[PDB]
Design a protein around this ligand. Structure first.
Ligand SMILES: *CC(=O)N[C@@H]1O[C@H](CO)[C@@H](O[C@@H]2O[C@H](CO[C@H]3OC[C@@H](O)[C@H](O)[C@H]3O)[C@@H](O[C@@H]3O[C@H](CO[C@H]4OC[C@@H](O)[C@H](O)[C@H]4O)[C@@H](O[C@@H]4O[C@H](CO)[C@@H](O)[C@H](O)[C@H]4O)[C@H](O)[C@H]3O)[C@H](O)[C@H]2O)[C@H](O)[C@H]1O
Ligand code: CL
Length: 370
């Protein structure tokens, strides 16, 4: 009894609008966009440069060709730390954003993101019990408040849990079972809702190596797995050279440099992507289990000038088309990581301030890849 029970209005199981299995639900989704740096921002929905999610944004997203949004959400900072009660106002706000995305005929995946680290950086036997308790209390509140949405709303229990060995993986399995049991306990449409479970560090290789099983579920065929993809780091996100490796400015057959050769990839090209996706195809998809590719993007390097710029941008685009297409070919649901930035080292494909397209190049790539 570290915190009180938040499962206070359990409802009869309700199969209405909840007719699809994870596999069927997955058939409906081919392209996803993260509302990145927004509802998960530390300090508030607008503390990381993005405006509050508006219907206009969600209408643009649907209209641009996305079927789904992944909505990272911060929770801990809105919560009474003694009782783990989440502000009702935050809860209403997350509900309201869910309602609007569902008004726009988008599928929606809400998580508890990094959220300041309380779970994500503490996949550890010392923290296991208090974190299991907090997981339970928060998921009880989130699931109850969102209980009435149809199958357009999926839940994801964690973001990127830092488990790098089998001991930490056993703690993660517990954190995931707690999530599943929380949500199911609230009843209603939550008795059948599709839930998404995260691999260790959402890393394909560590998931293949460490993952053992899915949490136990009272529902039949309502679970998906999730990985992320930022491979190779040197291209997608590296902003400075280190002793151990240099930033890649270019990527893809066709788009490599002959002037500035050390800025080409030494790894993480087309074959590696295909290989990593095949691990996820054989461990999960062939076994009956869709895989959410919850985040991928290669950041823009607008600090390049002239011919270097022009070439980086061509490979960047292709990287995104290639990832999308190769994931879809193997039953991974690709969700683009959009942090809303339109500046250097950012990933925003929309201009959130004007509800317009900022990077038509990357959007067409994603679409043609879809
Ligand atoms: C493995 C995996 O899948 N990881 C995922 O990685 C992606 C890619 O990194 C993550 O998204 C990134 O999140 C960080 C926040 O990071 C926290 O949560 C993720 C944790 O893993 C990490 O340990 C945590 O620190 C985002 O960084 C934050 O960005 C905001 C906004 O401003 C920046 O980004 C937009 C650009 O346009 C802009 O140029 C750049 O500054 C920062 O907020 C600003 O901070 C300044 C500094 O004081 C302040 O002036 C200003 O008013 C604020 O707006 C914040 O400082 C910074 O932490 C990153 O953008 C995002 O891509 C994903 O969450 C993982 O799941
Ligand atoms: Cl349908």
């Amino acid at each position: 009894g570290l915190y009180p029970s938040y499962n206070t209005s359990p409802a009869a199981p309700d199969s209405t609008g909840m007719q699809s299995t994870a596999v069927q639900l997955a058939g409906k989704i081919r392209l996803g966009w993260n509302i990145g740096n927004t509802m998960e921002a530390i300090g508030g929905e607008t503390a990381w440069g993005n405006p509050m999610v508006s219907n206009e944004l969600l209408k643009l997203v649907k209209d641009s060709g996305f079927d789904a949004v992944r909505i990272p959400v911060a929770w801990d900072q809105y919560a009474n730390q003694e009782s783990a009660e989440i502000s009702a106002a935050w809860l209403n706000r997350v509900k309201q954003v869910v309602q609007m995305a569902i008004d726009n005929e988008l599928y929606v995946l809400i998580n508890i993101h990094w959220d300041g680290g309380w779970l994500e950086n503490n996949i550890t036997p010392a923290k296991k019990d208090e974190n299991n308790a907090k997981q339970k209390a928060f998921w009880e509140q989130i699931a109850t408040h969102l209980r009435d949405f149809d199958e357009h709303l999926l839940f994801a229990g964690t973001n990127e849990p830092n488990a790098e060995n089998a001991e930490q993986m056993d703690v993660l399995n517990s954190y995931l079972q707690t999530f599943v049991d929380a949500v199911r306990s609230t009843g209603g449409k939550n008795a059948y809702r599709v839930l998404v479970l995260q691999g260790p560090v959402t890393d394909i290789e560590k998931t293949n190596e460490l993952w053992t099983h899915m949490p136990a579920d009272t529902a039949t065929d309502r679970l998906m797995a999730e990985v992320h993809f930022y491979t190779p780091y040197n291209f997608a996100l590296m902003r400075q050279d280190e002793s151990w490796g240099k930033q890649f400015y270019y990527w893809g057959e066709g788009f490599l440099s002959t002037t500035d050769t050390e800025r080409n990839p030494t790894w993480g090209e087309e074959a590696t992507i295909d290989q990593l996706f095949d691990l996820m195809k054989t461990k999960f998809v062939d076994q009956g289990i869709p895989v959410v590719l919850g985040e991928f993007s290669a950041m823009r390097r607008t600090n390049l000038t002239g011919d270097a710029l022009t070439l980086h941008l061509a490979g960047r685009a292709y990287y995104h088309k290639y990832v999308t297409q190769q994931a879809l070919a193997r039953g991974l649901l690709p969700f683009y990581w959009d942090n809303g930035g339109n500046d250097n080292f950012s990933s925003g494909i929309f201009n959130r301030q004007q509800n317009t397209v900022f990077d038509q190049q990357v959007l067409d790539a994603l679409l043609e890849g879809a």
